[PDB]
Symmetry: D2
Subunit: 455 residues, 4 copies
């Protein structure tokens, strides 16, 4: 047993994918309640959870897992594994990362960074796939392996929300509040800093297996070796470029374009002579045409809010989130009740069970709650889905299927009413054949499950 294997068996038994995302996150920070965490701590404060349980994460990832993937899997330096010694010197021999070369670099003082553990570990995959569903943002991970008595990286801050889960050994972390207003919730990663750049840490602790450390983007952090032992931790990262400003970036051009098409005031010609009083050379001119020009800009910018296509941009963001998502991890029930667990197979020179079909009696809901998004584009409707994504980020292009207007209302019904079962024959389409057709298309793609297995 282990608290991790225990929460996973529980996850396997929770019917809603939405609820199992909430449960897993609750586990991640236990005993702190998530509502308190998100309202008071998320994006505001560094958080230490002292677990008092070295066993908490057992089974998530281990140095033994890393050793195994080095030999059994096609781990490449640069692409998958960084080896670094500390200024920062990257000792990446080009090519395959063999145990021989990796472990040799480690004995010589290099830290090992696995860039994509979810690509090679079914457990990390499941972990990130369920968690992405309650962030609404891609969730990545790196695993870090630090040898005994090695110098630590320079202090710096990142552009993502970080959760560090201490897996093996011990490490002394120092984290710092943003040092100036500009660095609070920073837009981009920092350069490396000198000790003399830093204030006092807001948080300093020796992390032990099972512990958790969270800090927002813009919080400087630094870590060093302890007690003559090694260190392994997994870092979980989210909220890359998931800002009110990023939403605004997409909204604005569309809003100006809408205001122009729909309001004459936006289509009126500039003054013939605004170049006489606007421009850097005129920055302290006391010309009242300049004051009037400025006001008119502010008035029009302000009115643009009425023209903001918020819903269409929400949908484009949802489309990109689908494209960024890890593919889903099916429960045993979900598998059994879907195309994936359907007993059609080759058996003694022939297939068996071919012909199993949906009927109007079949009861139906989406496989999971975070696998699909209906998006209207250039007059047409497309259901984008995650079920064919690779465990490698953007390895695949975005996948969709066209949803026809006769079946649009049924689709929104399915998306809106998970995990409630609905009869195929109760789907709001104009025809029986449109009901079956939508149901079959979705089931075949792996987007749907049936209340009982087919035939």
């Amino acid at each position: 047993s282990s608290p991790l294997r225990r929460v996973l068996a529980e996850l396997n038994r929770i019917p809603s994918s939405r609820r199992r995302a909430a449960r897993l996150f609750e586990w991640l920070i236990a005993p702190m309640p998530p509502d308190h965490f998100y309202r008071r701590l998320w994006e505001r404060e560094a958080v230490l959870v002292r677990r008092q349980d070295h066993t908490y994460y057992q089974g998530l990832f281990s140095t033994a897992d890393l050793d195994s993937m080095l030999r059994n899997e096609e781990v490449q330096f640069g692409q998958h594994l960084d080896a670094a010694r500390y200024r920062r010197e990257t000792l990446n021999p080009p090519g395959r990362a063999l145990p021989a070369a990796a472990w040799s670099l480690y004995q010589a003082g290099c830290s090992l960074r696995l860039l994509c553990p979810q690509a090679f570990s079914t457990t990390v995959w499941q972990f990130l796939a369920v968690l992405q569903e309650q962030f609404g943002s891609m969730a990545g991970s790196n695993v870090y392996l630090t040898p005994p008595n090695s110098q630590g990286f320079a202090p710096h801050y990142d552009d993502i929300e970080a959760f560090v889960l201490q897996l093996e050994g011990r490490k002394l972390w120092r984290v710092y509040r943003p040092r100036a207003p500009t660095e609070e919730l920073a837009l981009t990663s920092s350069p490396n800093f000198s000790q003399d750049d830093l204030g006092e840490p807001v948080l300093q602790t020796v992390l032990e297996p099972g512990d958790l450390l969270y800090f927002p983007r813009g919080f400087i952090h630094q870590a060093e070796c302890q007690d003559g032992v090694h260190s392994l931790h997994l870092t979980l990262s989210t909220y890359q470029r998931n800002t009110w400003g990023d939403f605004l970036e997409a909204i604005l051009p569309l809003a100006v374009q809408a205001a122009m098409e729909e309001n004459v005031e936006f289509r009126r010609g500039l003054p013939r002579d605004f170049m006489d009083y606007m421009g850097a050379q005129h920055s302290d001119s006391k010309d009242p045409r300049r004051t009037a020009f400025m006001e008119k800009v502010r008035v029009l910018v302000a009115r643009l809010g009425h023209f903001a296509p918020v819903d269409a941009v929400a949908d484009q963001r949802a489309k990109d989130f689908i494209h960024d998502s890890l593919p889903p991890v099916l429960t045993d029930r979900e598998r059994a009740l879907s195309v994936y667990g359907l007993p059609i197979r080759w058996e003694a020179g022939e297939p068996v069970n071919v012909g199993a079909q949906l009927t109007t009696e079949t009861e139906v809901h989406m496989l999971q709650d975070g696998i699909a998004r209906l998006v209207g584009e250039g007059g047409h409707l497309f259901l984008y889905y995650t079920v064919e994504n690779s465990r490698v980020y953007h390895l695949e292009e975005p996948k969709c299927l066209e949803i026809y207007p006769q079946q649009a209302d049924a689709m929104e019904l399915l998306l809106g009413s998970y995990p409630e079962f609905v009869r195929v024959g109760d789907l709001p389409c104009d025809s029986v054949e449109d009901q079956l057709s939508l149901a079959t298309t979705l089931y075949d793609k792996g987007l749907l499950l049936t209340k009982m297995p087919l035939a």
Copy 2:
């Protein structure tokens, strides 16, 4: 001496380019006062000026000019010249590919084809001057086309355009119909229309036979249509401006910069979105009762409103001035601007040798910008550049943007030169530190053709 010829001779005597762009525009719409035209009619009303003077434009452009350019210049179908006819409500284009010889052009004319010259300012020094001075009081590029229509025919279907149009009737006559924007969306239209049918149109707001000397103006979005009757041909020149010179176009450039500035400088724009906003935002949720939607939409409007504060208005103005400089026709110099500038220097080869090689600028030399609408200072990434117009081609965008770096020690003297046209300043009185820097700026600008001197060097 035609009125066109008198105003040009008059222009030659006006020292300020700013003042002569005003004077030509005044002449163009005479007797209507420009102040009245601009406050009430510009972008609002179709406008007819009945000149009462068949000679008003004599010398600007004529069918003979067209004829000789066809035989003496490399005039190409498609690129330079269109042949078109609009028979029975249907538009057709009859450009045989390649060079447009008189033989081919005049034969298409006899077959009922209108001929349209796309860039008369490339082939005519007077259309060039005309546009080059007018562009200076529009603050916007001024283009033109010439239309030659054979008797008893129409070249073009009814449509509206995306520019401000002034038609000058040059020869013969033509019956024009111009229509109010037919719906609020077509008012000051953003793009040119498709060809319409008669069925699409209401009653013209203006219907008139144009005669030589007459002017017709109408805003973008006004549908128009023109017809040769009696038994006479027509020739007109259409002057176009204000392409994409809209407040919206200004906003289009300003907003991405504003958002970026807002994000660098104010944490509210850097806060994370909600983890669950996709549950209540998006097309499938427009019906939603969910109070979180109302809050979300409010936040959008608040933040959008705050962008005003972050809008780099002066920088985008400077960027649009750069583009305008890139768009401009090169200047037409008056006799005395020539005589006083590098252009009218007597240095020449004569009898096996260069003569009159002796002249340089001194601290005593008095100096101002060659003209007032030929150059613009712009700050690009910690550097300073003077963009100018004097080497632009008469052909639109043939030349790439032209500039020269102005160094920090020269910046204030440059701003002064620009800000004080047409006031002569002594080179030695120039606000630099060094005698060297004062003289260096002056020689650079002079040699480049941006600067004139009080007396010939």
Copy 3:
């Protein structure tokens, strides 16, 4: 369980040389026919049938059950990995839904009449990979495969010819094949695949036969073939294909532009000006001209073209082909013993919070040979020397870029000896190098890359 295939695979594991095991595996492929006879008389010349009289011959290579398992456990895609098609009354249909090919979809297609073809079984099957990887080594050319599964009472494909050499291994069920001599001189050893033909424009088959599990059918590029499933049984075969664009012409296509350039640089006759007026008697409008200057001109073309042979960089072009071949190659399959004697097998592992068995290096006394004989090639380009290798290639064709490492002139002569002396062990101290550091660094480099094994495990 035992099968002739499993038996030969075990035999291969005991042959030290990779060259000898490629020879042995190909010998098994066509047994009892001797290879020498096959290559001298049949290869590129005649369709060949091997009646095996042994339904178990291939057992262990690939099966429909294997295909089922790869469809369910692997991300097999329609179009890119798998085609579903039916050849009906003479005309081709292609029924690929887009996206993932699940067992549910694949088998429904199969029951509705569709043949299935898997385009790169070697990506998903370890045994097909090994089979192909050793075979490539004695073809000197990439060996690919497809797997074809045909439902009872059906044909998958119209009659056509191909642009590769085909060995068809009948794996399950039976199939009636017809193969035809090239119909016209132009189609012999054809350069491109034909369009689909009608039965009407074919002659008489040169070979017509029901294939049975264990049989092999070989025929050259340009031979039309057609295959019918009968008697309510299905068919499964794997087609092995090689010799794509591996032609004397292809070699010439690369040698000639280089030779003209060399001729121009080195010989003034190729730098002399053309006649000022050759366009008066040369060109399509002059094909019937009686001008003698036309005759002189064409004689001159012929004379100069013939001289180009003396200027042909034949070796540099051979090396560019070996490079491309290294790039097309499947990664190698190591024998138990090769693993044990290479970087891949040293006992460095993570045990109880630390690495164990770390550091056992190479001495001047350690004995050494190339890991296998068809995994690297030394290529000089632009005044530098590179060792292109195979061991980091993926089993997906061209998924990875060409991989190399630089060899410095101080190491060149030793590299040649290692490439040239396989599988004879050479002591590191014997490597023909200036220094002793140069002997160790080279040896260490190759070993660390997986290009070299040691007589005794380090």
Copy 4:
């Protein structure tokens, strides 16, 4: 008048464009016979023609012409005009427009002036080059060089084109040298600059006077220096850029291999399975006799390639490239009078007059000139490429062709092959009258054809 104005007046009355190209080249090198020149000197020997007539080129180009073009045309530094002094060569080009004030001031400071495209701005240089290209079979370019008094001359070097220097004004001491090694004979590329130590005795040393001509093959080193304290002006005519037996072959051989592969099975046979065992740089000293056989076979096959060479198609491609490189033709008074360009159609008093006489079957025709068009087979169709819309600026225009339909091919071939014989349109080898008139009219309208009497 002058010898140049005389030969130009003469050209005006020679009816054949071919015969005028020949006549002008005779003039260029008079009293040297063209036959002797091409037979024994061209590409073999430096040639001096001491003319004894300072007046010989008067009318071609002058410094006074340079001066008006600096004022009346939009001449640009870099693009049209270089100013340099010599090392090495120091370029003193200001960027942008080359005004009289800037060019003359650079000259007076000791810079030489090089005009790159005189044919673009001089009508008589245009004619000179346009007629001369027609008997070279190769683009004829020119530059004009103005050298101030007492200026240090350029470094010795050789070029990759055939050069004729025409001394226009003043005087210049030229030294020219035989190619110094086999590899420099008829060199493929221009050399770097040499030092005086690298050279020996000039094969040709002379002070050029106005009217003189100096010719030397590509590969001959040359240098010039100031004389007698006077300025110098000369025009250099260049041709035969990349017009070599090797350049022809370069185009022939890829297509020959391709054809041999399509047409003969020997080229379609597989390489040996193990050639890599004895071919390649590792094996240059292999004793294996399989290497000997492999070699012989390459030579044997390379030798058969000559039977497959599409000589004619490559001829036509080089001809199409020459058509594209060519200057537009200069029409005689008669050629203009008898063609579309000479039709009297004009605007007079509000109307076109003299409009549209038509070609009939009775009209006698021939091609406008002999080197203005080429009939080329491309992708199963026929195109007539032509020169008459080319710019006086090199490649300013793309290739111009008109499609010629199979029904009109014989008649087009006849017209191209019978210049300057007149033929009745009715006697054109077409199956119908429409096709005869259709072709003639098409050619006439493009400016490709003249009529025996004006229409």
